[PDB]
Enzyme design. Structure first.
Site, PDB file in Angstrom:
ATOM      1  N   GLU A 149     -26.239 -19.960 -39.277  1.00  0.00           N
ATOM      2  CA  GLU A 149     -26.088 -20.100 -37.831  1.00  0.00           C
ATOM      3  C   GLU A 149     -26.783 -21.346 -37.274  1.00  0.00           C
ATOM      4  O   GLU A 149     -27.403 -21.309 -36.179  1.00  0.00           O
ATOM      5  CB  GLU A 149     -26.556 -18.787 -37.149  1.00  0.00           C
ATOM      6  CG  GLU A 149     -25.819 -17.613 -37.735  1.00  0.00           C
ATOM      7  CD  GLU A 149     -26.291 -16.275 -37.229  1.00  0.00           C
ATOM      8  OE1 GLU A 149     -25.721 -15.244 -37.679  1.00  0.00           O
ATOM      9  OE2 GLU A 149     -27.214 -16.252 -36.361  1.00  0.00           O
ATOM     10  N   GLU A 152     -21.279 -12.668 -41.623  1.00  0.00           N
ATOM     11  CA  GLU A 152     -21.904 -11.639 -40.774  1.00  0.00           C
ATOM     12  C   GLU A 152     -20.937 -11.322 -39.660  1.00  0.00           C
ATOM     13  O   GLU A 152     -20.467 -12.238 -38.974  1.00  0.00           O
ATOM     14  CB  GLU A 152     -23.215 -12.096 -40.121  1.00  0.00           C
ATOM     15  CG  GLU A 152     -24.423 -12.370 -41.045  1.00  0.00           C
ATOM     16  CD  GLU A 152     -25.747 -12.504 -40.255  1.00  0.00           C
ATOM     17  OE1 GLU A 152     -25.900 -11.943 -39.125  1.00  0.00           O
ATOM     18  OE2 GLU A 152     -26.671 -13.107 -40.820  1.00  0.00           O
TER      19      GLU A 152
END
Ligand code: CAC
Length: 391
Positions: free
Chosen positions: A184, A294
Site C-alpha cells: 500500500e 488484501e
C-alpha cells in the site's frame, strides 16, 4: 487442476528458488482462469470461535473452518509475529522462542496442505514506534547510505533466520512463503508510503530487500508480491509509479476494502472489476501472476448487523464476470482480531456463546460453495510439480 506448467520454465525473481517454491509458482500460474484460492490472515489463531489458549502455537482451529467446514487455501501471518506483537509470538518470549513459534504454526498448516503468505508491518526503525508512525524519514535512513542501515539489516537477518528454519520435518523441504514487502505504498499511512518516501527511494527499498534476502542471506523459499492500494480508476501509471522492475516482482497485487456504512454498491464493485482487469493484463504481458492480495468488507471490518448481505458473492461475481479480472490467482481477507474494527470472516456460533451465527454466514457459505472459489481441499496438488525450471 491440470499440471500445464509441469516440465516448463519460469522467470522467477529467485532463479535458485526451492522445489516447493517453484511448485507453488507453477500452480499459481495453472489455477489462473480456473479457480481463485481464498486466503485468511490469522486463519488458525484469531477468531471469535477459537477455544484454544494463549499464543495458539500449532493451532488447527479456524474461524473459516468452523464457518464452512474447510480451511482457506492460503494462511496469512505478519512479520509482527517474529517480534512478539501478534500470535503465535509473545513479547514475554525470547526472540528465538517467537521464531520457533511462528515456524511451528506454519509447519502445522503446511502439513494440512495450506499455502503460507507473509505480510510485513515493520517498526519505525528511526523513532522506535510502529508501522503507523510515519515520521523520521525512515526509508532514506534505512537504505545503504543511511544512518539506520545496519538496524534494518539486523531485522532482515531475523526474517532470513526464520526462512531457513521453515522446513518440512517429514520431507526436508523448504516451505515456500509468499512475501509482500512494503505494501500500500501509494498511500501515506505507513512510513514507507508516498507522503514520506519518493517513488525512487521506494524502488530502492524494494530491490534492496529482495537483493539482501536472496543474495546476501541465501533465502530461496520466497515468492515476491508487489501490492499498491486501489482504487486506480484503471490508470496503470498510478499502479506502476513505484514498480521496482520485472526482475524484482513475482506477483502483481492490489489491496482494496469496501465502505463499512454502505458496502456492496456499483462504484466499488465496478472499480474492482476495472482494477483487477488492469493488473491481470499487466501480469499477462509480463508473464507474471496477479492477485487480490488484501480485500475485505471495510478497513474496520463488517458490522455486527445491518450489512449488505450479498457481499462475499457480489465481490466474487465482480471478478468472475471479466475475462481478465477472473484470471487472478488468489484473494485474501484480513484477521478476525475482533469488533469494533477487525471482523472479516463471518462466524458460525459453534461454542454457543456469541448469541447465534453471524448474519453474513449464509452468503459466506455460498461464496465457499462457488466452484471458482478454492479453499484448502481445492488447492491440493499445489506441491506436486517435480520438474519446474527457472529463468
Ligand atoms: C491490515 As493492513 C495494515 O495490511 O491494511
Amino acid at each position: 487442476i491440470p499440471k500445464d506448467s509441469e516440465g516448463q520454465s519460469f522467470k522467477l525473481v529467485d532463479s535458485n528458488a526451492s522445489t516447493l517454491t517453484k511448485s507453488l509458482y507453477a500452480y499459481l500460474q495453472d489455477t489462473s482462469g480456473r479457480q481463485i484460492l481464498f486466503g485468511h490472515q490469522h486463519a488458525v489463531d484469531e477468531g471469535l470461535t477459537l477455544t484454544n489458549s494463549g499464543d495458539r502455537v500449532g493451532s488447527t482451529q479456524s474461524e473459516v473452518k468452523n464457518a464452512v467446514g474447510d480451511y482457506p487455501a492460503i494462511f496469512g501471518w505478519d512479520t509482527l509475529s517474529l517480534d512478539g506483537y501478534e500470535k503465535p509470538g509473545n513479547e514475554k518470549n525470547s526472540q528465538a522462542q517467537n521464531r520457533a513459534n511462528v515456524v511451528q504454526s506454519m509447519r502445522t498448516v503446511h502439513e494440512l496442505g495450506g499455502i503460507i503468505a507473509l505480510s510485513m508491518h515493520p517498526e519505525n526503525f528511526v523513532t522506535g514506534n510502529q508501522y503507523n508512525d510515519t515520521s523520521g524519514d525512515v526509508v532514506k535512513n534505512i537504505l545503504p547510505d543511511g544512518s539506520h542501515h545496519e538496524v534494518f539489516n539486523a531485522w532482515l537477518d531475523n526474517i532470513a533466520a526464520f526462512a531457513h528454519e521453515l522446513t518440512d520435518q517429514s520431507t526436508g523441504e523448504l516451505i515456500p512463503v509468499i512475501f509482500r514487502p512494503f505494501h500500500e505504498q501509494n498511500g501515506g499511512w505507513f512510513w514507507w508510503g508516498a507522503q514520506t518516501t519518493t517513488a525512487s527511494e521506494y524502488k530502492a527499498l524494494y530491490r534492496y530487500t529482495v537483493d539482501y534476502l536472496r543474495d546476501v542471506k541465501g533465502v530461496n523459499n520466497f515468492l515476491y508480491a508487489f501490492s499498491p492500494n486501489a482504487p486506480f480508476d484503471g490508470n496503470l501509471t498510478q499502479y506502476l509509479r513505484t514498480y521496482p522492475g520485472d526482475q524484482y516482482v513475482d506477483i502483481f497485487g492490489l489491496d482494496q476494502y469496501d465502505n463499512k456504512a454502505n458496502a456492496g454498491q456499483a462504484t466499488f464493485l465496478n472499480g474492482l472489476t476495472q482494477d483487477l482487469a488492469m493488473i491481470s493484463k499487466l501480469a499477462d504481458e509480463k508473464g507474471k501472476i496477479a492477485a487480490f492480495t488484501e480485500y475485505g468488507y471495510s478497513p474496520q471490518g463488517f458490522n455486527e448487523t445491518g450489512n449488505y448481505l450479498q457481499w462475499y458473492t457480489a465481490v466474487l461475481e465482480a471478478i468472475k464476470k471479466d475475462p481478465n479480472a477472473s484470471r487472478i490467482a488468489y484473494m485474501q481477507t484480513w484477521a478476525n482480531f475482533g469488533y469494533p474494527t477487525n471482523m472479516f470472516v463471518p462466524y458460525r456460533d459453534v461454542n454457543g456463546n456469541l448469541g447465534g451465527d453471524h448474519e453474513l454466514l449464509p452468503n459466506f457459505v455460498e461464496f465457499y460453495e462457488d466452484d471458482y472459489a478454492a479453499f484448502l481441499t481445492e488447492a491440493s496438488g499445489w506441491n506436486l510439480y517435480q520438474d519446474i525450471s527457472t529463468i
